[PDB]
Amino acid sequence: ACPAERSGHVAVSDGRHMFVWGGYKSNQVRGLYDFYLPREELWIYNMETGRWKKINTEGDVPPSMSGSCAVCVDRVLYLFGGHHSRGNTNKFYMLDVLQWERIDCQGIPPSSKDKLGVWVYKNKLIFFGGYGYLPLGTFEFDPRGWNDHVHILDTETFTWSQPITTGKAPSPRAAHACATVGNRGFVFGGRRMNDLHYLNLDTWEWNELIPQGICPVGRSWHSLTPVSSDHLFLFGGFTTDKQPLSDAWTYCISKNEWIQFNHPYTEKPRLWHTACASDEGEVIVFGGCANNLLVHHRAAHSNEILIFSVQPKSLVRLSLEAVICFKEMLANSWNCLPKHLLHSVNQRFGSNNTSGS
Amino acid sequence: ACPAERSGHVAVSDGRHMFVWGGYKSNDFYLPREELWIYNMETGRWKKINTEGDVPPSMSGSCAVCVDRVLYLFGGHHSRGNTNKFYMLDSRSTDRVLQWERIDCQGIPPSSKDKLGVWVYKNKLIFFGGYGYLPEDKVLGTFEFDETSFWNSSHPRGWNDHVHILDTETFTWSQPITTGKAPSPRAAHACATVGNRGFVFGGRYRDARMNDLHYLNLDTWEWNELIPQGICPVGRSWHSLTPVSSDHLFLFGGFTTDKQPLSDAWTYCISKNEWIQFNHPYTEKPRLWHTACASDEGEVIVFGGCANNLLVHHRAAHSNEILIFSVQPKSLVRLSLEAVICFKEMLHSVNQRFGSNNTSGS
Amino acid sequence: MDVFLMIRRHKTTIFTDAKESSTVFELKRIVEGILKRPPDEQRLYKDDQLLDDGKTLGECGFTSQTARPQAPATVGLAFREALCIEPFSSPPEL
Amino acid sequence: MYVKLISSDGHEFIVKREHALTSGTIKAMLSGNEVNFREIPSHVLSKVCMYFTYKVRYTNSSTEIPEFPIAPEIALELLMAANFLDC
Amino acid sequence: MYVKLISSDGHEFIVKREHALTSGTIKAMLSGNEVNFREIPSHVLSKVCMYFTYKVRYTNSSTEIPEFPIAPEIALELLMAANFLDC
């Protein structure tokens, strides 16, 4: 009914369903090997109801890995990179009994990385940063090291391409956060850094943005998800002093300023957690750790769901929750139901003729 | 670097290093014959070494042992059927490329077969059972044709209950005269040696996998069947059975009669003659046609195998994961070694430490 | 069930095992064979309290889940005298 | 700029055009002013207009969003009206 | 039958003879009773004695092995002592 606690997993979203795969957990007894959760399973969380469904996947199943990068385009999962018991990986997997598909793309694939970020444009997948072995851009060493590559993959024809960078690219880093708002591909934090950059996905030009005023503390293993066309949402992180973070920020894009966001989860800091935006103005974050991750035997991996109410809910959702609340009372009531209204709605959404049987 | 996923491979160890060879994986495909994979059980890191000479064909179901760091390989199934050839590889050599040696043994060898077991007693390798063609010689024991192979195989095959002795001093085959009721012919059974007792558990025969436990006394050559009072692990084949003490055998994984993969672990106490189920974190990672090797630090290291019913080849979930079962208390040096490695940010064996830190570099 | 303990007089630490149902009088006889002192000349203590001879170890607060071999429960011992357990050395901090 | 939403019983609700765009249905009907609702009564449409001002005010708001009260006896009417209006 | 092991600060640890034989170095000295470790402090020797009890208890247990806790401040000293005692 609930996935095992994990960190370093991937969570993708279509607006109403959240897909969770991979990650790793700490064993009960202290040891020197991490426990990677089974490759065979994929967890789906319904953001309207709050329950989980576990489906086992066959086919070209990718190995159990952590720190991978995933994206959900038209309910089609794209997975690249990560880290397993043998080392880093540069293999690219896709997933629409569901079957994983290992695709041999044209062009030159990137190196084996993890803790990177990704952007989604019209039909291109744009990956940035990471950490891994030696193979455009730079590659600073720590045998692995931080990354600057901006590899691009076309989903229409499956060709690995790299863009011509105009402007100052950001520094090598991993465990950064990426968010997409229109043609802007945002980066923030990592290494714990505090810089804020965006890349124009249309002109392929790097830009540096310097917010004015109070700014979030430099962090790693944070989450950055857009909550509007002019707002980004940052939660959690990992300071330079390694202090876990339970604070949330809202970054206005047009005004280029930062505002703190209040929430009832100040007692539950998270790092290496995933975050997904719902269609009801919420940010759903799952997994991550509350303790210090560097000490693996003392890690406290979480399987909880934290819901931030960033935007007001729709009138449909508000009314439906009122109906759900007053279920018994309304079952003994009656109300008018104009046919033209009902037919207009059922024209848009359809009506199932087999229900109730 | 990283050995590819495989089932039907062989894995042998000296208590510190695990040697991995052969096996097969789906695209069917046998893994490169010249590759020898060495897994360092202390550091948890893999190493690849190439081989030369009379390199055996790539095979699954071969039977292998490590005696005094010498690798001995018998039987198996390559792409052109079963064999009964015997190979030796001396891992103590300083060659950059180790030289396989195929030994023409004296005496009459066993039939061409795979998926058998072996016991290591004083100066002898004792092989039992398997699946393959009819013997090409007079042999003590029983052979039984697999009726499903008449119409579905290029040549009929079946199970045997043969016992064959390979004397490592002279490389001569022989067959002991045994007493008592030998176990039925079988394949994909599991063998474990404790002193002069060669235990055999499970396997497949005719129809339906089994959970009978037998042992052959390697001094008196007297077969014995153990009937434990109480619960027993379900019948299975393609399981692993590893001695973990002078009195305990460790059983993991396998394949039920109803084709269900298994993730259960059991310990059999030889003196008490009883089974006890073993709690472990790998309940969601069933394995069959895997290998298991005992470590010098009270661990059983499981490698390879398949998570599901591999009889459907295109949907077989072959693995290269390492599964570690802690079945005996570790040494304080090893425990203190792990503690120091666990805190490298707070403070040669500590220097090598382990590999593949998923957290480092963030 | 088995409980694993440390019996500390002043600077002498006795590692020993016992059951929850065993009396603390029986624990005194274990000390008798090791330190050659009859039980009436001994007095055992927990953190601060004194244990009556008739009470069992589990009744005194020594459950199996706390008195483990890798972290035995401490039992103070006084001869015939105020109980005084000297601390062990201190590890250098990092 | 203001727009006028007219209920079935003839009530005229004049709201800000930006607020009325909260409903996708109203946004499509204005795109190219008045909008007529022959099947939405005023006790429902007035509640919808209150949601318009509530939704716009607390969109991208630093302070916590308050609860929107919905009486049970109008919940099902409001749900159907909201689904028709797409807000 | 018990044995006495004395640390570098004069602390005396009385453990079972079967438990102390886990250390090969202790086995060698006893076979050549009490043993004096003029270079092992009491905070490390107490850790070592609990390992003796832990090793004997959970050997041939046919059960999952519990954790042996080792604090980071004592890890370096515990490693060297364990190496010296061959246990």
Residue pair A275/A287 in contact by the 8 Å Cβ criterion: no
CA distances from A271 to A23, A32, B78 (A): 13, 21, 50
For residue E67, the distance in angstroms to the closest alpha carbon of chain A comes to 5
Residue pair A216/A247 in contact by the 8 Å Cβ criterion: yes
Nearest alpha carbon to residue C72 among C62, C87, C58: C62
b/e string for E24-57 if b means 16 or more Cβ within 10 A? eebbeeeeeeebebeebbbbbbbbbbbbbbbbbb
**Interchain contact, E9 vs C14, CB within 8 Å:** no
For residue C11, the distance in angstroms to the closest alpha carbon of chain E comes to 5
B342 Cβ under 8 Å from any chain A Cβ = yes
Q: Which of E48, E60, E87 sits opposite B331 (nearest CB)?
A: E87
Please give the span between the terminal C-alpha atoms of chain E, in angstroms, as a whole number: 20
Give the residue on C whose Cα is nearest the Cα of E65: C70
* Phi and psi, residue C31, nearest 5°: -65, -35
Residue A35's SS3 state is: strand
**Partner residues linked to B223 by β-bridges:** B216
b/e string for B70-83 if b means 16 or more Cβ within 10 A? ebbbbbbbbeeebb
Give the residue on C whose Cα is nearest the Cα of E77: C91
Interface of B with E in 329-348 (CB under 8 A): 329-333, 335-337, 339-340, 342-343, 346-347
If you write DSSP's letter for every residue of A175-203 in order, what string do you get? Answer: S-EEEEETTEEEEE-------EEEEETTT
Residues of A with Cβ-Cβ distance to D74 under 8 angstroms: 335
Nearest alpha carbon to residue A61 among B5, B129, D56: B5
| A-B Cβ pairs (cutoff 8 Å, strict) | 77
Count CB-CB contacts under 10 A for residue A157. 11
For residue A63, the distance in angstroms to the closest alpha carbon of chain B comes to 9
Token match 């934090």: residue?
A189
User: Using N-to-C axis directions, what is the helix angle for A339-349 and D75-85, rounded to 10°?
Assistant: 50
Nearest alpha carbon to residue A126 among A83, A173, A82, A69: A69
Give the residue on E whose Cα is nearest the Cα of A28: E67
Residue C52's SS3 state is: coil
**Interchain contact, A30 vs E65, CB within 8 Å:** no
Angle at B296 between CA B295 and CA B301, to 5 degrees: 10
**Partner residues linked to C50 by β-bridges:** C45
Q: Which of A261, A330, A349 sits opposite D75 (nearest CB)?
A: A330
CA distances from A175 to A69, A144, B14, B86, B104 (A): 11, 14, 41, 52, 59
**Partner residues linked to B47 by β-bridges:** B38
Half-sphere exposure of A23 toward its Cβ, with a 13 Å CA cutoff?
A: 28
**Interchain contact, D87 vs A252, CB within 8 Å:** no
Q: Name residue B195's amino acid.
A: G
D68 Cβ under 8 Å from any chain A Cβ = yes
Interface chains of chain C (3 or more CB pairs under 8 Å)? E
b/e string for A173-191 if b means 16 or more Cβ within 10 A? bbbbbbbbbeebbbbbbbb
- In angstroms, how far is CA B217 from the centroid of its own chain? 21
For residue E64, the distance in angstroms to the closest alpha carbon of chain A comes to 10
Residue pair A127/A69 in contact by the 8 Å Cβ criterion: yes
Substitution target in A25, A32, A61, A115 with the highest count of B β-carbons within 10 Å is A32
**Any alpha helices (H) in B34-181, and if so which ranges?**
149-152
- In angstroms, how far is CA D64 from the centroid of its own chain? 22
Residue pair D52/D18 in contact by the 8 Å Cβ criterion: no
What is the spatial distance between Cα B276 and Cα B264, in angstroms, rounded to a whole number? 11
If you write DSSP's letter for every residue of B28-45 in order, what string do you get? Answer: -EEPPTTEEEEEETTTTE
Residues of A with Cβ-Cβ distance to D60 under 8 angstroms: 227-228, 230-231, 250, 252, 311
Half-sphere exposure of A164 toward its Cβ, with a 13 Å CA cutoff?
A: 1
Substitution target in E54, E58, E65, E67 with the highest count of A β-carbons within 10 Å is E67
Interface present between D and B (3 or more CB pairs within 8 Å): no
Domain residue ranges in chain C: 2-94
Strands in A129-238 per DSSP E: 131-132, 145-146, 152-154, 159-161, 177-181, 184-188, 196-200, 205-209, 223-226, 231-235
Give the residue on D whose Cα is nearest the Cα of A333: D73
D20 Cβ under 8 Å from any chain A Cβ = no
Residues in chain B: 362
What is the spatial distance between Cα B30 and Cα B309, in angstroms, rounded to a whole number? 18
Half-sphere exposure of A216 toward its Cβ, with a 13 Å CA cutoff?
A: 33
Residue pair B119/B126 in contact by the 8 Å Cβ criterion: yes
What is the spatial distance between Cα A163 and Cα A120, in angstroms, rounded to a whole number? 15
For residue E21, the distance in angstroms to the closest alpha carbon of chain C comes to 15
Residue pair D25/D85 in contact by the 8 Å Cβ criterion: yes
Residues of B with Cβ-Cβ distance to A294 under 8 angstroms: 345, 359
Nearest alpha carbon to residue A114 among A127, A131, A137: A131
Q: What is the dihedral of CA A35, A36, A40, A46, to 10 degrees?
A: 110
Nearest alpha carbon to residue C10 among C93, C60, C83: C83
**Partner residues linked to A33 by β-bridges:** none
For residue D1, the distance in angstroms to the closest alpha carbon of chain A comes to 23
Residue B81's SS3 state is: strand
Interface chains of chain B (3 or more CB pairs under 8 Å)? A, E
* Cα torsion angle, B182, B183, B189, B194, sign: negative
Q: What is the dihedral of CA B302, B295, B126, B305, to 10 degrees?
A: 10
Q: Name residue B192's amino acid.
A: A
A320 Cβ under 8 Å from any chain D Cβ = yes
Give the list of residues 6+ apart from residue E87 with CB closer than 8 angstroms, or none.
B331, B332, B333, E22, E23, E24, E25, E26, E48, E51, E52, E55
What is the spatial distance between Cα E19 and Cα E26, in angstroms, rounded to a whole number? 10
For residue C4, the distance in angstroms to the closest alpha carbon of chain E comes to 8
Interface of A with D in 173-232 (CB under 8 A): 227-228, 230-231
Residues of D with Cβ-Cβ distance to A323 under 8 angstroms: 75-76, 79
Nearest alpha carbon to residue A70 among B330, A62, A166, B154: A62
**Interchain contact, E46 vs C88, CB within 8 Å:** yes
Q: Which of B247, B336, B342 sits opposite E78 (nearest CB)?
A: B336
- Pair type for strands A282-286 and B322-326: unpaired
What is the spatial distance between Cα B328 and Cα E61, in angstroms, rounded to a whole number? 8
CA distances from A182 to A82, A161, A168, E2 (A): 27, 21, 21, 77
**Interchain contact, E14 vs C34, CB within 8 Å:** yes
| A-D Cβ pairs (cutoff 8 Å, strict) | 86
Q: Name residue B91's amino acid.
A: S
For residue E79, the distance in angstroms to the closest alpha carbon of chain A comes to 16
Residues of E with Cβ-Cβ distance to A29 under 8 angstroms: 64-67
Give the list of residues 6+ apart from residue A62 with CB closer than 8 angstroms, or none.
A39, A79, A82, A91, A93, A100, A102
* Cα torsion angle, B107, B111, B115, B116, sign: negative
What is the spatial distance between Cα A100 and Cα A40, in angstroms, rounded to a whole number? 10
Give the residue on A whose Cα is nearest the Cα of E65: A29
**Interchain contact, A175 vs B362, CB within 8 Å:** yes
- Burial class (CB within 10 angstroms; exposed 0-12, middle 13-18, buried 19+) of A122: exposed
Give the residue on E whose Cα is nearest the Cα of B246: E60
Interface present between B and A (3 or more CB pairs within 8 Å): yes
Residue pair B320/E56 in contact by the 8 Å Cβ criterion: no
Give the list of residues 6+ apart from residue A243 with CB closer than 8 angstroms, or none.
none
Residues of E with Cβ-Cβ distance to B276 under 8 angstroms: 62-63
CA distances from C86 to C10, E15, E65 (A): 6, 18, 32
CA distances from E23 to D5, E28, E29, E30, E66 (A): 90, 9, 10, 11, 21
**Interchain contact, D80 vs A230, CB within 8 Å:** no
Interface present between B and E (3 or more CB pairs within 8 Å): yes
Nearest alpha carbon to residue A24 among A357, A320, A301: A301
Q: Could you tell me which CATH number the domain at C2-94 has? A: 3.10.20.90
Q: Which of B269, B335, B343 sits opposite E62 (nearest CB)?
A: B269
Residues of A with Cβ-Cβ distance to D48 under 8 angstroms: 315
Nearest alpha carbon to residue B11 among B20, B24, B2: B20
Structure tokens at B341: 């490695």
Half-sphere exposure of A110 toward its Cβ, with a 13 Å CA cutoff?
A: 30
What is the spatial distance between Cα A99 and Cα A42, in angstroms, rounded to a whole number? 11
What is the spatial distance between Cα A20 and Cα C89, in angstroms, rounded to a whole number? 49
What is the spatial distance between Cα C79 and Cα A251, in angstroms, rounded to a whole number? 71
What is the spatial distance between Cα B164 and Cα B277, in angstroms, rounded to a whole number? 33
- In angstroms, how far is CA A297 from the centroid of its own chain? 26
Residues of A with Cβ-Cβ distance to E67 under 8 angstroms: 28-30
What is the spatial distance between Cα E16 and Cα E1, in angstroms, rounded to a whole number? 6
Resolution of the experimental structure, in angstroms: 2.6
D75 Cβ under 8 Å from any chain A Cβ = yes
Please give the span between the terminal C-alpha atoms of chain A, in angstroms, as a whole number: 26
- Pair type for strands B143-145 and B117-121: unpaired
Q: Which of E54, E59, E82 sits opposite B333 (nearest CB)?
A: E82
- Pair type for strands B98-102 and B45-53: parallel
For residue A342, the distance in angstroms to the closest alpha carbon of chain D comes to 7
Interface present between E and C (3 or more CB pairs within 8 Å): yes
- Pair type for strands D2-6 and D34-36: parallel
